């Protein structure tokens, strides 16, 4: 209710069968579709997002509303605009001589990164991407190619390609890059994708990016009907030192919902929850239980929250469990809905053929990304595209789900490849009735 210009969501009326990624109820307040920003260092990734949204934000999330002027007298592309998530769903036009209101068409979230790991393990569901390519450099730069291989792997079809920094670059040189791009995407999953020139710095042609975000990127399918699951990507203690007792507040779980809807006052559990070590060192896991106290997407309060965006969940849970991201890696959802808890995985796996900036061995050290959980893991057995891992920390996850693998190369972590889970070993949860 805290924002009276926006949709009055209501749990008495909510019909989850009737939700769509464009339902104004929802879109008024939260983003419903996620757009990754990918490229190379200094190619303007974060800066494009900052230009579209106004936001200044291991992953990072920024929502932006996208509007169309309801005037026939609009010259293209200036029919389109973008704004911060808290802005009203209609406003009168800026553009002189044009008449009527901008009206909200779409509300999107930009999933910015310093990225390959998160892409391959599906920790950040990207419904689409912006491939940024700086004109002042050639195509592809190393990360640019690496990212495009990552896109091919993730099978994301809908893409926009952004030639950035055109403020620095003369038209002759600008067009000289264009064929490099065209050739580089030819033979790849990006082959059909639009190329748009922009300046993130001077905010040239941003309207076009918005136009093509509305037009090229279709409404993705969603699972609103299942019981929900969220991945905890951040967790917070909101209580500032000095706190008096009545003013103590819950720990807050922040994540991207994958399915279902969270509702205020819904009862939830978290897996694996609290990890504890038995007499014989044997792992034992107690799921955390609680109640949703409140819901947020950025500065917008919600009574229900739906996949897309990063959604903040207020809870009863003692802050000691949420503080300084202690719950990151956990899965959150409705009671009895959550996946099984695993300590060992059999996986089918695939590696980077290029030694970018070789195959497995037994008892090899790995760090492994499953959902938001970077855990230590160690190899148990090996074949040419199949093997087995034992995990340092237990995880909550699904058979078939993607996971990503890193080795301590040059004495520090680099990704080497990925796999699907095909079988695994689970902990029985211990619940005190």
């Amino acid at each position: 209710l805290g924002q009276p210009h926006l949709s009055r969501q209501d749990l008495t009326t909510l019909d989850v069968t009737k939700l769509t990624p464009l339902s104004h109820e929802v879109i008024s307040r939260q983003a419903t579709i996620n757009i990754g920003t990918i490229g190379h260092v200094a190619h303007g990734k974060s800066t494009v997002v900052k230009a579209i949204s106004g936001v200044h934000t291991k992953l990072g999330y920024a929502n932006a509303k996208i509007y169309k002027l309801d005037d026939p007298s609009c010259p293209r592309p200036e029919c389109y605009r973008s704004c911060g998530s808290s802005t009203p769903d209609e406003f009168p036009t800026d553009i002189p001589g044009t008449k009527g209101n901008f009206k909200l068409v779409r509300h999107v979230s930009f999933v910015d990164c310093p990225l390959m790991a998160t892409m391959l393990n599906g920790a950040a569901v990207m419904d689409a991407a912006l491939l940024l390519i700086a004109g002042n450099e050639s195509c592809p730069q190393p990360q640019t190619s690496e990212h495009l291989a990552a896109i091919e792997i993730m099978k994301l079809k809908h893409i926009l390609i952004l030639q950035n920094k055109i403020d620095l670059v003369k038209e002759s040189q600008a067009k000289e890059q264009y064929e490099q791009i065209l050739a580089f995407v030819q033979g790849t999953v990006a082959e059909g994708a639009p190329i748009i020139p922009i300046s993130a710095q001077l905010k040239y042609n941003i309207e076009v990016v918005c136009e093509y975000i509305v037009k090229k990127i279709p409404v993705p399918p969603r699972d609103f009907t299942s019981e929900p699951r969220l991945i905890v990507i951040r967790s917070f203690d909101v209580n500032k030192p000095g706190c008096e007792v009545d003013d103590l507040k819950g720990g807050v779980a922040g994540g991207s919902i994958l399915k279902g809807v969270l509702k205020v006052g819904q009862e939830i559990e978290v897996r694996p929850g609290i990890v504890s070590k038995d007499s014989e060192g044997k792992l034992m896991c107690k799921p955390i239980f609680s109640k949703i106290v409140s819901l947020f997407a950025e500065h917008n309060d919600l009574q229900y929250a739906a996949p897309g965006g990063l959604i903040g969940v207020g809870t009863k849970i003692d802050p000691t469990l949420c503080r300084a991201d202690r719950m990151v890696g956990q899965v959150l959802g409705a009671v009895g809905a959550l996946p099984e808890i695993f300590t060992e995985l059999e996986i089918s796996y695939f590696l980077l053929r290029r030694l970018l900036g070789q195959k497995l061995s037994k008892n090899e050290v790995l760090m492994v990304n499953i959902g938001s959980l970077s855990t230590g893991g160690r190899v148990s057995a090996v074949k040419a595209d199949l093997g087995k891992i034992v995990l340092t920390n237990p995880v909550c996850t699904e058979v078939g789900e993607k996971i990503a693998l890193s080795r301590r190369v040059e004495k520090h972590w680099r990704l080497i490849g990925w796999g699907q889970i095909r079988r695994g070993v689970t902990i029985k949860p211990t619940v005190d009735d």
Partner: peptide, 9 residues
């Protein structure tokens, strides 16, 4: 694709 296979095995 050959492009993917140049980067994967």
């Amino acid at each position: 694709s050959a492009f993917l296979k140049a980067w994967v095995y």
